[PDB]
Amino acid sequence: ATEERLFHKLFSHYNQFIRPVENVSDPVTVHFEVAITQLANVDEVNQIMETNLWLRHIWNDYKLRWDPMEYDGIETLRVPADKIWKPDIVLYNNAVGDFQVEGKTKALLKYNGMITWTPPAIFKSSCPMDITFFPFDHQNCSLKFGSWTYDKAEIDLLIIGSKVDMNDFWENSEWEIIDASGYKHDIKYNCCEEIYTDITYSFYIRRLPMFYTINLIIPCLFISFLTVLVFYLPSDCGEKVTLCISVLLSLTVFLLVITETIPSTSLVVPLVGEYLLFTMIFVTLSIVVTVFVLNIHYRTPTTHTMPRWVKTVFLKLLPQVLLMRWPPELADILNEVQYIANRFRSQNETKEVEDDWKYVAMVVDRVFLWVFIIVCVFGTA
Amino acid sequence: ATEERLFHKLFSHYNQFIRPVENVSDPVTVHFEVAITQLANVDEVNQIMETNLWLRHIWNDYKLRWDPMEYDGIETLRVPADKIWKPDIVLYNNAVGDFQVEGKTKALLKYNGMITWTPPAIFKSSCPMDITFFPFDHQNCSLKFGSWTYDKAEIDLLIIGSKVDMNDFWENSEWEIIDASGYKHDIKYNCCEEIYTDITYSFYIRRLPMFYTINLIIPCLFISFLTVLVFYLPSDCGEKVTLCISVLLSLTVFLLVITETIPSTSLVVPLVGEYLLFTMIFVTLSIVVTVFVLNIHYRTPTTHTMPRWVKTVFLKLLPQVLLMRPELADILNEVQYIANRFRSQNETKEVEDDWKYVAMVVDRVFLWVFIIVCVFGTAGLFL
């Protein structure tokens, strides 16, 4: 029945803009702590982290005190935030939005002037990223909290505990919290001539790779497997060019997608991008060999002549190495029959050359199957 | 000035919390009318209607009255809206926020107490899309206004006219408005105790079917036309699989785009979706048949054998129904072999040519079946 009287008498001789220090030239103590409720998302393209926090301020007051007697009971009280003086603890490394804190939750004022202010806030900070192990990577974000206008000589920012209290956290599905610690630093800035105090809270998250493996890694290896099969196809099937083109287009699509879904930092290159470019350049190199093999399969003595060294080579030396074994009226009738027989003899002699060119194309295809299968296997390892 | 005295004597004791009534038992008769300005959009995937409209309120205060002879500056007093009493007319069926667009504007004030407040408002109403004849559908999105606090015994929501005024409308390019009307009800809600009144304005719009006819009907019709051809190609060229696979891929892509366009309501299925699914099933059936004529066209007497029944049944029935209609002895011994070799080769060849004719009859059988079946189901599905 006297809370209104207490409010009227307490909020009569009060100035909001003055520090609550009775003996001037004495720094005031502000206790700081933070609580995390939900890590909304970690944006990798724009390098922005979004969290929800409960900042906690507990500072003693040289005023705003009374006696529990007279006003029977009423040991504590709640007052609007705007009426009392508050410190302006701002977030330095902002990314987008406003520097100030949100919410207007009232402050619980104790018997001796101790004030507990716990306003909610949702922050969008800036976090550098390393993508050198993109499917399985660790990130080291950081939040920097410090007073803007006041300095060390007027503020004595301390900490409660060297840990963020995980008393209420809706767990993120894709990121796992592994560590969260805070530290206090004493720094001196430029364009200003006094020492300033700072408090940094640095998260430590880990990724769960289930979504980014069965969707990105397995198809990549499936397509990388299909490349080597070009050199086992026969040249007469007619489908030799389709396989290479399909593999190349699939690699193009996969590289495009992974490039789309990663940050554009040029400090380093991901270990997956190197492999993708490596497989891409070999896949391009395999279309060239196919064209230079299909041309040897369709050569005939009527248009091309075999040289004198492609006989000793590609037929005796290389096949051995690659384990390829090489498997009156009678006169008028006489000349008519003789011409028919001689035509057959020259047809089989020509057909002999028409299969030597077919065997050379088989050797060249085989000698590149082993070169590829080595570097393709060795390249991953 | 006399206007200052008028304002002072008006707002010397006025209170903005009490219904302006002579007694405590009389409804405040208010008139209502809605003028539409611009139909913004009729978004369907996330069913919502957006409009710009002006709300016209007229009622009769009793303490805001002055002599039009004692004073000057009479018959008009533009008073700011948030200073006098105001009925709380809100849109019930709202999609997101914007339960009441108050604004500031101004309120007219005659010398007999009347007020003619008219604030602009933009409303993101929610109306359920009904698709069965897309893109020739016919929508009936509606708006519902009502006083949220006062019941029928304290506010009487009358109506003026019988339709929304349209003499401000910037005509839309996709939707054509057919008939917009309005009507009044009396409701008794479960979480209440007294009678409540509401006024509902229902718009009746019709789509303009040209944007979706060019981009969704012509290409799909072409694709549906092209799938019949695969039964006319010869087996020797080797291009049946290309044609059927391309048709199937195009149909799948078009069906997925159509899915991306229309909402996710699981009540009724559009006719165009039914036709797309039917054509997809038919195309999938053709690829199965094409494999079984390619497997037949490449049979030889060395591997396969004719079982004496396909021969008779096919080659004796199907084309009719389908309207397909020393030393000299040594020379003889070696010469005899050459002639015998040709006799055996020719006997082999005539059997192989019989397998090629069977695959021609089978292919033409399904050409007639597909044409017949694809049209007596389309004639039933499509109206």
Add this chain to the structure above:
Amino acid sequence: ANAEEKLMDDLLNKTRYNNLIRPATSSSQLISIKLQLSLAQLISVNEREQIMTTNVWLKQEWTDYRLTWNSSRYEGVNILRIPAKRIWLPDIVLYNNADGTYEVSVYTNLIVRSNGSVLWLPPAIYKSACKIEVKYFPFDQQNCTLKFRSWTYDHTEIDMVLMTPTASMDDFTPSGEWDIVALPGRRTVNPQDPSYVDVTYDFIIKRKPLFYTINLIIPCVLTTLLAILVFYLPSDCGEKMTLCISVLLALTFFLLLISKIVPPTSLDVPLIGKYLMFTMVLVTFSIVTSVCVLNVHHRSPSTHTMAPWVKRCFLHKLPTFLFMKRPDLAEILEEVSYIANRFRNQDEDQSVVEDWKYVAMVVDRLFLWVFMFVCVLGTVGL
């Protein structure tokens, strides 16, 4: 309205009633706040961001002892419509919001009865944070909650309570995607930390699966049933690789669409999203076997030799397990003999060529059954 003005002025001015003090005239005086949520329309559920949007009318009723007139001295008014920002309020807000804000929607009038009751009822449109489970995606049932907590006070100051053990439908417009199963309500209190109390409403919903059965599911089955025809095309046709590659890309494209209606998580994957991977593996193995069969088909005695062990197993034992089976005159004499002898050598090689075209036919039939037994076993195992 001469009675209402004097009533309001006296009640809200003469006492100097301050709307910053919780009504209490005892040691504790826990002022209880009745709650009864009322649904109006289920707007949407977003399974990608795990956010669900509703349209509810929260109802609160308490008893303020500072608002009690006589109701006969004031000409019998018996009721009032004081606007919201003049009465003490308990500040009940949603405590699991998605965007981050906690504040309530538009402030309307609140009815004050003649014995001190209050019946505030503000409309609102919330956006909660649900946990979407995706394991039977076309046919799934979800469980979304709405937790309401006091933003200013707690126990030892208030005590929340319910009036009905369920949510009320009233003005409800049915949706076409989800259908309501039940709406239970429960009050959570921890009997070891006194400063805690809340009221939770469970939204249990179930999908209507005709849309994603007409789409998605049926085309997936149609394109999966085409994966076995590669084993029936003849090897000399020339479109074996055309058929078996276009199918794999079609399956790959369908998988990426499914991962677009599914939240990015690491806990659950749809049963439909696991069948596609199995079919992908089967199709890749089919491609490898088709390449091997193509290589075996195109063989000749002039480049390859048939090993004696190949001639036995294939062409004798495996095919029957698969139920399949198949002067002067001297010059004329010499010249004619050569022509006959040349024809004899050609016929002997054509028989060896035709052996390779039947070995490749037996192999393709062997893999037709093998790639059929493992397809049924995998499908059953899901």
Add this chain to the structure above:
Amino acid sequence: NAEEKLMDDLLNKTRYNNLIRPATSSSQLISIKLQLSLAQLISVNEREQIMTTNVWLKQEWTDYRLTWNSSRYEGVNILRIPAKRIWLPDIVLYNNADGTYEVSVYTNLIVRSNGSVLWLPPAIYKSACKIEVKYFPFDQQNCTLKFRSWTYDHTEIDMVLMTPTASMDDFTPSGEWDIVALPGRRTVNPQDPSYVDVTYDFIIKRKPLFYTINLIIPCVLTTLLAILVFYLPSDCGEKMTLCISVLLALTFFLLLISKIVPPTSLDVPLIGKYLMFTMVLVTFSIVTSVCVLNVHHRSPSTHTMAPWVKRCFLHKLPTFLFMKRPPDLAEILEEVSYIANRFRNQDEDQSVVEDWKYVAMVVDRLFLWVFMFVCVLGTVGLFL
């Protein structure tokens, strides 16, 4: 501190209530000179038919309650004052689509010794337009801005024009659109006089350098690949690939063009009709290619040849297409005669095959002439 003196006296001595128009009598319409100054063009987005502009609306009028002289309070003649202190006419854009009506931020005015008031508030605007797209590569439009007062009418205010053209003094040239003319005009209704406003037109050009050398040449390359489709030989076995690829590319280009700009509100652009015509031609080409392929693969063991076919083709049609078409001694005799007779029959079964191969050459060439002519005599209507 003469500003302190003048500011305190003017708003209180004269009882400036900021709610009453400065009228000496009932019918004393307050003239309000107007002018618009363009600053930027932003976008003329055609998907939603909504523009975006930045303007400076310069207004001027006279107030009889703001006058001071004959005392010379430290020599002050300008009394710069915030907007929300004195009467304003509330002139707003009356064709907005967003729903925003008033200026962006209320700036300060100027007040002179004789009472004149000058105001230059900035404001962004997103008006509504009717887009004519029948000449999409290079199109000319006409977009208007309407200004009106929602509190007063012609019996209270007298909106007038300073100059019949907006000012581009501070206009930053844009690299997408070209300005032609900006004529301003007034409007009034002789019947029932209560309507008054001013209107500004924004006649613009698209300066085609992005949609004329790109996306116009790829739409003719794929258009002219059809004759290539018709020139291929049948034994090559690649006709289907080329024709299907051409059709798919045309469909993709048409869909992309439709996505970029909404094709038809009442009229279709001059490129969509061309693309539809080309797609129809390509479908007919596919059908004729299938027919030619079927005709090519025929032999005198599966099909026969009617005499009318040999009369029509190979004789008359090729000429008009300019084609040329250039003891045991008795037993051994029996076996030799069989071999020779078999070869004679084979030679006759090949000539018939070569007759089928040449017929498919005439049909293929004939449709090339029709395609090359219809594609030219059908493009005059929709492009001229």
Add this chain to the structure above:
Amino acid sequence: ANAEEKLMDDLLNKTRYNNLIRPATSSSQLISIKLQLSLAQLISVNEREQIMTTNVWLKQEWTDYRLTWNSSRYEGVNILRIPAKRIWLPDIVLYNNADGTYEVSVYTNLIVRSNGSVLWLPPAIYKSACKIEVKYFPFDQQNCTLKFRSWTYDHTEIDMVLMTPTASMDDFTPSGEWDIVALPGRRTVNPQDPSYVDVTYDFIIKRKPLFYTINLIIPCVLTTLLAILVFYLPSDCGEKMTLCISVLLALTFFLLLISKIVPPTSLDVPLIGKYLMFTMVLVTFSIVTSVCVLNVHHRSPSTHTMAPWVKRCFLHKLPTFLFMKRPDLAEILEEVSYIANRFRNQDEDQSVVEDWKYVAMVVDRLFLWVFMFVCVLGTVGLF
């Protein structure tokens, strides 16, 4: 009590300090606002919309003669912290903004010294409007600027001054996407305009070409080298047009990717955006010549006849330049004579057929040199 509140109670009120009146001691005297920008972090540079966003601090200084107090009357306290607003403020804001609201920054505090000096340093996040020039992408260097003007006052009232020609870069964390070259500051005034004054800070930023030199430039080069390969094919495989169409599709994909990272202006096109169009034209011409070669290769004497000029040119002249080098007995006689004469005519047909194949090989090799010569000489004009 602590005299810090007494300083305020004796300096602001009582003497009635005014925050709406300029501190000009008299007429014809200008204020001396100083300025010094300090960068803190470059957030991102956008090219699709030409918007650059930063996080900068704007220190300001001036003098107010009213804020003066004796340092000995009040014990100590040389410096006092006046809070947000509460004193005169020259409203200096960024001119060229993205939204165009000209919104002011939030107010934090003003550290006021004893001798009238006022220091301010508000933090802000700005989104200006740049003029991105894309002609050497991805090796380009840009120049986006910020302009600061007074929102209320003008010249003849204030005198903007740059405290240091360069902009401070302390407490600057760097960016892995863009570099920083120089940050000059200029002061622009017009001798004829009596009310124009501002300060402009130029940002010269160099891009780091490693996310594109490994992602876009290399695959384009590989695809072009593939595009060369068409002419080295035997023309018997039946897969000539597949390579051409696949290369064209890949080039189209790569071109469509680029047009999403480039403003849709009409002034210039990247040097990598013209090489692709050149390659598209070359590939289309290669398609045309491949169709012609395939048509030529499949000619037989029973359909076409070889003109003497074709033979004389393409079998003797061109290959040198291209370096290519190539009664019972009577009845038996009557029956045998036909068989040999049948073979003689058959060998003449094959000789003519094999001549049409060599013509299609000289034509093919001729265009391998022509296209390659153009593909290099025509490219050296693009660098």
